[PDB]
Structure formats: structure tokens, C-alpha cells
Amino acid sequence: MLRFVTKNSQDKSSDLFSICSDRGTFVAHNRVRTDFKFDNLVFNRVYGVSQKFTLVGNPTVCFNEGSSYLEGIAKKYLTLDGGLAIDNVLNELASHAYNITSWRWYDNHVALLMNMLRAYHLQVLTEQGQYSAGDIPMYHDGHVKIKLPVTIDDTAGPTQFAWPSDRSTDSYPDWAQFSESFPSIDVPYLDVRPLTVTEVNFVLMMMSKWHRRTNLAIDYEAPQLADKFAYRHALTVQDADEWIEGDRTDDQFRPPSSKVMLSALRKYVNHNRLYNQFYTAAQLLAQIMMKPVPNCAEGYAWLMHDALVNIPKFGSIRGRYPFLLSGDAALIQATALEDWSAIMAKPELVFTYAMQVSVALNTGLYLRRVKKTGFGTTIDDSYEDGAFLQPETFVQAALACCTGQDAPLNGMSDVYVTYPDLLEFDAVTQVPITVIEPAGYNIVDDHLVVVGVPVACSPYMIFPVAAFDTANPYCGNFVIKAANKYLRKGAVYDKLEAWKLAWALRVAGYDTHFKVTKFYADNGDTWTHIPEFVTDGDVMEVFVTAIERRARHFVELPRLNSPAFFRSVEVSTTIYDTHVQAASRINLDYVKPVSTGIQVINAGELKNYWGSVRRTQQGLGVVGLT
Amino acid sequence: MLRFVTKNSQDKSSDLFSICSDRGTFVAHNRVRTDFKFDNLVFNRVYGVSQKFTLVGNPTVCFNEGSSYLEGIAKKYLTLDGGLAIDNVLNELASHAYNITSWRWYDNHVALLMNMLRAYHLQVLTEQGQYSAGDIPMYHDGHVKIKLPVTIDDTAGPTQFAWPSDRSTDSYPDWAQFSESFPSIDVPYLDVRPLTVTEVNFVLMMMSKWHRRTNLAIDYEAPQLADKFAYRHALTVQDADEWIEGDRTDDQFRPPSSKVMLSALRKYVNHNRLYNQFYTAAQLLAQIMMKPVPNCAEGYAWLMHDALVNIPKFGSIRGRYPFLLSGDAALIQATALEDWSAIMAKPELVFTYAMQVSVALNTGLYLRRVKKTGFGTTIDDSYEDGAFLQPETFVQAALACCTGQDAPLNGMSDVYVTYPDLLEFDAVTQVPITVIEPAGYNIVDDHLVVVGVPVACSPYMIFPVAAFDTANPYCGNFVIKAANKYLRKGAVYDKLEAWKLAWALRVAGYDTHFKVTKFYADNGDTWTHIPEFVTDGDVMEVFVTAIERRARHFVELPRLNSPAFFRSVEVSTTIYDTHVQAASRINLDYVKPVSTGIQVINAGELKNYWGSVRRTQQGLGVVGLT
């Protein structure tokens, strides 16, 4: 994910942002200058654009077991594939020799790593002093009032990060202390030797069942990862045990700080060599993290829609034997290693990547819906069902169709964040609406309806996004061309050319009408949504009438509508300064990972989904890392 | 004056209009189409313009004797010059031979002809049913209320044309009947043989003193033309005598109708061969007749200013001997003969020529004032005192400077209509003003002041007027050219180019601002007055800022102010239909005069002022007819 973020703008920028919330939402502000050069008369207008985001969500999570991955053990303990070298293990150690015939090796700690990630982010948020239940923004446009419900009330919601479980009200895993060389039960054991006492306590107690107490998307409900397990440690750690039996009071046993929690993460991962599984965990957390708050009224359907996540069941063989984590670690992906090094250099790469993936996902789904019609795209590709069926490649396909670069795959099989109710282009949403005054809006029975996925963000977190083959507002610059034909009342225009002209005029300060009435563009973002009527098929020409001016006008432009006054206006848009408000630039040359004691493979296996998906000219598809 | 009127537009048009009044004022409406061709995109806007006129005036008339003109007698009764051939007269017949040594021959009937002209026009006006005292229009512009006083109140003023004199309250001339061949007294006698009884009665009784009873300009006060005289007629006519001695009541002795009055005019003139004197009379009446009502507030100074007229004293030798009017009439100007034939073909040539001369006079005085500064004109000619000193060539010089064609001279020496208080460029006027709301206006002590002569009309009765050497709104068409230099806030412009641009934009529908604030142009005429500030010297460049639009907008035009959007707009204005409202086309081929029994000379004598004045390139001056 490091390559994706560092390639959205340029290899030199590498701009990162920290987590911030304000009752569950935050706003990312920008400052952008737009040019207008025509007849060697360069004009410009500098303005600020704001795209706010919300961390409130209610994703659905299913905990279903999957494949077993052993890409962290020594070379001699692995065969030519991911399967362990059982003969080597036994020629090293009996009853176990006969027992092994009945010991499946299901080692997959992705659920644990994701749990630690969300707990760390929650603790960072509460030490930042703004952790709360989280509430959706209340959007009101003079004509329509909307307010999506949330389960947990913010005011009564907790302000401090409590432990996910309860006071012994629910059962807890039967943990144990392990120091021998003989695994006694096929139940998984962990190896937490480098961890300190408090880190081990946090790990074991958070293994227990998690309860959802806030509307935060990373606060989803999760059951206990394993009913029984043991940890291979030098000493027994039992402070959390005193807490469950009802001895340690809340004040002395509180969730550990962010620094120690991140340290426990680091120790766990780089002692068990879980770089691949942690990369998968970070990918899933980034894809589940947050959604943008829509400026337009109909964009709230994106907020109401809930993702579906498939986290594999927890299993471990690392702690079963102590020599497995020794030796030379094998089959570690270079992308996973570099991503791990970067995220432990700065732990907010996940946050900035999550915001970028949210914006890219929304725009990719919407542009798939639009480019189905034939707007901007030459080839009538199978956008509907091509690479969006594969749940693991769903969000990556959306990112590829939006941005055009190689979206990083989950790196793990049978894990995905998927919107099942979004593959169809007929899917509707009933957003609650208390209409203030009647206007142009498809308001039927107190809820307007939307078709497919709407726009809820603006392509400003990722600006140079190459959505279309030709120049467009999504691209850096475009040239407004002559109309197809001019008439008395106006001129006809192609779908894309008309939208480009309307966008440029809205930035300049002109309101643009059309027939077969307004090009919508909300203030505070000044990005013109694609018109609903032109979105559908059978419409190839747009009649532009009445290019009127607005109350506030910035750049004064020719008519471009009358043949006499049309001029080849060439525009150009560049983003200058961004600052979230509820930098931190990274340096690749200082975060390079540890190549020693690690065997690194550049390529991956398509079964395990170690690759990327790129929007080819002939159609987007999955490709190998090679 | 026929050539002047028929050459203002074209030899084919020859458009004439009848007299009409509405409480002393009338309005002449037009319908004019203005073009706007640029980039091969011809645009046009059709609109109506109205220029109202007023017949109310109080001219000052001085009755001072002048030269004696004998250009109607037979050839044998004249010498090589205007002097009579006394030897021929005597070798034709004594005591008279000795008496003649004491008989000056002062024959000049111009006062009589002018009196009959004004009486005929008044009778036409009263039979039209709209004769009254006449009142000045009350102009009000939301900011300023003005109403010039008039001596005679309209409501109590007479509605029927009464006889100019009173009921024997004033003395009357001692008329007599003459039938012999011997003039008994050096007192003048008239020859009215072809006239009927009623025509003779009207002539003799109107010879008596005239009293001013209305505010009409042609109703000026005049004394009795001669204390004593006799008329050479077959029979004595004494009905007016019964009227003066108090016998004939008013009802039976009333002013004769228009037809019989015009018939008396015709008989008198073409029996006494007074074509030259009648041409002079018509010229003077046309120059005194009426003034335009000013659309702009400061233009009423033209209304307050009063002309000065020098009518020669009445004298006659035609009726002294009966053979003088016989023979071949000698020394008759072709222009006078053709003008006489035209005015007796239709008697409203005088009215249309008077309206045209009024508009041309106002515009000529104003353009002399403007072109003194250097606006539009290359040569700094002596506009102030060159040909405007000669009182007889004053109004003709104004017409020449305005229109550019040969203004017809008075054709008589020591006769003129002159504004003595107008030769100076510093002359001021105190127009009464009840100011409604304060605005841009030089209002000092209840009266704004004006400097020189203002614009009170628009060049629409005579449109193709060539005021300036270069193309201008006064000309048919002009091309708006590129600015001298363009700046951030606007562009600088020459005096004339800026005024042309402002006029074109006001016709199109754009309001034009400038600095070193508005280009004034009143509705109902949509002609833009020359700005006061640019009128004076030391100002050669005008800064044009803010070409804003108006409430009502007709032709949509490029900025012409910014270098990027400037386009070579070419305009064109043509007048289509005019109709006064309180045609009548003439046909030259049917009004050609009687060449038989008349000796016609094309040339004239500069002493007698038989010529014209043309605006030469090097300067306007009097030229001969040749």
C-alpha cells in the first residue's frame, strides 16, 4: 500500500496524515488554484475546497475459517510450497510422531492483528481526547433536512476507551502458560516471549470477546478468537486473570497506552514473522475504516450502505514449538515487508491510506456506473460483472477503475470487504428526508430514492486520478472545444464536453443551464456533479442554454456558447496545500526494512491473491507482481 | 430652400409635413433600425425615437428700414442695376417731372408678406381646431422639476384667431382708393387689382397694427406698416372701414379662411412679381418659427434664449404707376422662383423647412462650440467669430457648420435672425429649477447654469448630417476601433472614439462609465449627449471603466474594453418611417415654375446677399451662386 499512496501524486511527495475526529467526523481542507489561459491571457482563481469524512459505520463481519499460511517459519521447516516440512520437524523433536497424524496446522493470526490495530487506533483516539460514540453529520440544504440514525448515542456514549469485554459477565478464553517442548492439545498456542508483562496481558485479554459500544466502524462486534489457548512465555502473567476473577479494580487495570500497544504489535509481528498476515490485516482495516461525508443530498445512500467483511478464524502453530521462529524466515513478500517497515516507522500510513481508499472506492464505483453507459469511455467493457464478482478483488477493482494504477490486493485468500447489494446498477436506497421546501428532487413517500451508487466525495485527496482516457476535470487540465453545432438559443455539446464546460464555468463563476436544468455544484467543494439526465444511455448530445452568471464571480470568460465569442479556453488545476482539521511527511530512504535474516520473494501466487489489478485499455484484470 | 430640404436626404425623397400643434407643442416620431455587424454576424435592433418641438417663443423684432429692391418691374423701367430707369418712366408718363426730384423709391414689401404668412399659418392652425395661447412643456426627470413661464395663459387664451388689431381702440392707417395715373403723395400705394373684395379687405386691415395675444413665436407684436397709403383697385372696398367705424359686427366680419388668405397671398405676389421679397419673407418666417423641446434638463437654455429679427420698413412703388407691373419682369432669382412655385404648390414646405432649420441651427451652434475645443476637427478654425459675426449669415453659418451643405442665404440685405447673446462661448443661462432630489447637476441658487449652447434636439429630422470629417453617430455608420492602450481596470480612448463606443453601446443596451461618470442618453431618443467633461480642452484621452449592462438589453456585444474580447464592431443606422403627431410627399416634376414672362438670373450680388455658405475644409465662408 506504500507504493499506491506514494504513487497517487509523486514519489517525492509521500504525504501522510494523522488520525483526528470531532464527534466521529473530520474535515480535510485543501487550497487549489485554477488557471484560465486563452488568447495568451492567463487568468487564475485561488479557492479552498473542503471534503469532510466520517468514521461512523456499522460493517457486517463474518468470522469464517480459511487457508492456513506458514510464510514465517524457517526454510527447513517448509516444503516447496506453503506446507510445512513435517519430516524435518520430526527429525528434530515419540507419541507426538503418532499424534501428528491428527494435528492439522491452521496458523492464521489475521483476526488478532486486526483486533490489535483497531484497539490501538481507539486508544490513540481517546488519548487525543476526542474518542466518543461518534455521530453522523446532520446535513441541511434549505430544501431538505436529513439525519441518519446511529445505534449508540454520543452524549451518553463512553468518552474513555473501556476494555472491549465486560466484568466477567461473559466467558473468557481458558489461557495457559507453556514452557516445554511438547504441545499437549491441538488447541493453538502463541509465542510471546519478547513481550513484556503488560503487553502479554493486553494481548491475552483482548483475545477475549469484543463488544461494540460505539458507532465507530473499527468498533465492530467480534467474538472470542479461541475458547482455549496457551502462550509460550518465560513467566505466567495473571493480572488480567485477577481482573476477570474480580480482584483488580478498573483504575489499576486499564487499557494500555498507545505506545505500549504499538510496541506489543511490533514485538508480536517481528518475532513471529507475521509480515504477510499483518499486511492483510492493515489492508482490511484500511478498507473498513471510514467513508466520506457527501456534500450532495442524494449521496447519503453511500453512508447508509454497509460493507461485508470476511475475517478468517484465528489459529496458531507459532507457539507450538520454539524452534519454528528461529532460522531464516521464508517466503516474505517484499511489498509486505516494506509496508510493515513504513507503518511501524509511522503508524498513520494506515489512516492516510484508508482515507485515500475510501475516496477512490466511492469514485471508482460511481465511474463504473457512469462508464457503463458510455460516457467518456470508448469500449463497452463488462464493468458490471467483470472483476467485481470476485469479493477479494472487489475494492481493488473499484480502485483500479477509478485511479488507473495497480490497486494492491489483499494478499490472502477468502478475505474481502464486499458490498453485495452494490453489484447491480438498479439498487435503490430510501434515505430518510424531512423535506423543507419542494424542489427538483425525486421525493416519494418521505424518502428520495437513488439508483446505483452516487458521488459522495471529490477527487482531491487524490487529484491526478486518470478516470477517463481523454482530458477532463479529473485530469490535470483540459481544453474546451468548439460545439458540435450552434443554434439560435444555444449550442449542442457531447456529454463529456458539456460536463467539462460546465465544470470550468462553475469554477470561473458562471452557472450553466441545459435541456434534455442546472449543472449541480455545491459550495465548499465547487465540484460539479455529473448531471443525472446525461448519465443514462440514448443521450449523446446536450443542449446548453443560458450561461448565466452567479452572485459571486471570479474569472470573467467569453460566452463559449455563441459562435462569435467562442474562444479556446484552456484550464489547469493544481493543489497547493492540504491540512486536515479535526503534514507529517515520510522519508522512504529512512524507513527501508531489514533485509537480513529474511528471505524475500518479489512474486506471489494467484491462489493466495498476491498481486494487483490494473485498468488495461482492453479491460481491468488481475496481474502478477512478477 | 427647396434644394436644402430636398438635399438633406436625397433628391427622390422630398418629404414634407403639415403644421400641427397640441397646446403649442408637437412631437415628430421616427422608426429607426440600427445594425451591429461583427465576425460576419449581423445583429440589429429596431426602436422608435421621438423628438418633440414647441412653437412657443417670444422673439424680439425691430422694424428698421433698409435698401430698396426693384427686381419685379419691366426691363425698360430698370437700369443695369436695381435702380429704376427714371428716364424711361418719364418718356412714358408735367409737374411730376419736377416732383420726381423729390420722390425716393423705397419699395420693399417684406413686412407685409411676412404678416400675411403668419396670419395664414394662424388661420390654418385655428381651422385645424388646435389654435391656443400655447404653453411650454413641463419636463420632470425624477430629480429636477422645471417649467418655463409664458406671458399668455393657455386656458384663458383665445381659441379662435381674432383680428390682430382691436375695436378702433388703436389708430388705423388712412387708406384710400386710387385709379388715376398720377401719384399724388410720396406715400406708398399698392396695386391689388386681381384681388377680390374680401382679399383686399384682409390685406388692408392686416396692414394695421398687430397685437401679440398668444405665446406663439409667429404671433410677435408689430406696428402698423404705414400710417397712410392707397390701393390701386377697380372699386373701393370699405367693409373693414365699416368694421373700424364700429358698424360691421364681429360675426359677419371675421378673419378670412385659410384658402382665401393663401389665394390673396398668391395673387399679390404673382401680380407684383414679388418672388424675391416673398422668398426672403419665407426664409425669415422659417428661421423664427419654432424650436425643439430638449430631452435633457440643461437644454432648456435654448428655449429661454430669444432671437432678434430685423424686418425692413414697409414701402411700395408698385401701385404708384399701373404700367410698372406690365412688360417682362426682370431680375428674378431662379431659386426664388422655384421656391415660390413649390410653396404655392404645397404651403407646408415652409413648416418642414422651419423644423429642419431649427434642428440644424441648434446642432450647428452646439457643434461650433464643441469643435472649437478640437473634438473631431483637425483645423483650429475661427469658429467663434468667422462667419457668425455677419448677422444675415449667422443662422446660415450655423446650418453650414452643422449639415455641411450650402445653407440658403436670406437673399436680402440688412435682414437677419440673430442671437446676439450667443456668439460668446461663456454665455450662461439661469434656468429655473425646483430640484426634487440632489444628483449630478451644477445647481447653484435654485437655477442650474449652462455654458454656451446645449443640445436640445437629435439629428433625426436630418440624419445623414456630416458634422465631422470622420465617421461618427451623426454619419450613417462607423467602426469601433481598438483602444489606444489597455490597462487592468479598462482602456483609454480618444474623445471621439470613446463617444462613438458609448453611443453604440447605449443603442445596443450597455451603460458605459468613464473617469477624467456616466455617458448620458435619455430614453425616447436613445442619443448619447457628448460628455461635458470631455467637451473642454486639455483632455485628449478618456478612461473607460465598467461597461455594465442595463435593465433592458437588446443586442449582446463583446466587451470592447478588454484586449482579449475586443472585436471590430461595425454599426449602421438608417431611418425607415417618420410621422409627426400633434407624409405629404412633393413631386418636383409637377411644381416647376412659370418661365414665360419672367427674366431669370442664376447668379446674385453679394451686397444683396444672394448666395449660400458652405463648410469648406479650410473653413466655412459665403460663396456665390454663379
From Swiss-Prot, chains A, B:
<dbReference type="GO" id="GO:0019028">
    <property type="term" value="C:viral capsid"/>
</dbReference>
<feature type="modified residue" description="N-acetylmethionine; by host N-acetyltransferase MAK3">
    <location>
        <position position="1"/>
    </location>
</feature>
<comment type="function">
    <text>Capsid protein self-assembles to form an icosahedral capsid with a T=2 symmetry, 40 nm in diameter, and consisting of 60 capsid proteins asymmetric dimers. The capsid encapsulates the genomic dsRNA and the polymerase and remains intact following cell entry to protect the dsRNA from degradation and to prevent unfavorable antiviral responses in the host cell during all the replication cycle of the virus. Nascent transcripts are transcribed within the structural confines of the virion and are extruded into the cytoplasm.</text>
</comment>
<keyword id="KW-0007">Acetylation</keyword>
<keyword id="KW-0946">Virion</keyword>
<comment type="similarity">
    <text>Belongs to the totivirus major capsid protein family.</text>
</comment>
<dbReference type="InterPro" id="IPR036332">
    <property type="entry name" value="Major_coat_LA-virus_sf"/>
</dbReference>
<comment type="function">
    <text>Binds and removes 5' cap structures from cellular mRNA. Forms a covalent bond with m7GMP through His-143 of the capsid protein while releasing the mRNA body.</text>
</comment>
<keyword id="KW-0167">Capsid protein</keyword>
<dbReference type="Pfam" id="PF09220">
    <property type="entry name" value="LA-virus_coat"/>
</dbReference>
<protein>
    <recommendedName>
        <fullName>Major capsid protein</fullName>
    </recommendedName>
</protein>
<dbReference type="InterPro" id="IPR015302">
    <property type="entry name" value="Major_coat_LA-virus"/>
</dbReference>
<dbReference type="GO" id="GO:0075523">
    <property type="term" value="P:viral translational frameshifting"/>
</dbReference>
